[PDB]
Write a protein that binds this ligand. Sequence first.
Ligand code: Y0G
Length: 119
Amino acid sequence: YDIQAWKKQCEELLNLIFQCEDSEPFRQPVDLLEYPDYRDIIDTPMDFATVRETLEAGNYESPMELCKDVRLIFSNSKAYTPSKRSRIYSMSLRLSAFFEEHISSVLSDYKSALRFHKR
Ligand SMILES: COc1ccc(NC(=O)N2CCN(C(=O)c3ccco3)CC2)c(F)c1
């Protein structure tokens, strides 16, 4: 029922994600020089370094907020892909499955801890 435990859990999951080869396209904000139409398609860029920095700054209140930003990485990838059979899009889908597998217990434990706190 530790209301704070999500934060280190998220730090460790981001470490795992940074070790995954599938995260390479998503570790830093997209360079518009490589992809000059990116901001014509994507309104809100997001990347894992931005998520880690937001966490480390103390600017997430809950793991739900972190989860919304990580999901935005994957939805941007789906929105920007020219094909479902894209190398970088397929990397996003495997990394998304890995992230969802690991974040589920973090979210569950947090919401349970908050319910206990308000009991
Ligand atoms: C040298 O540091 C960097 C900085 C940024 C990046 N990443 C990118 O430019 N990507 C291309 C666009 N993209 C897609 O979702 C997508 C779907 C289909 C095609 O692209 C997101 C990531 C990189 F690879 C190295």
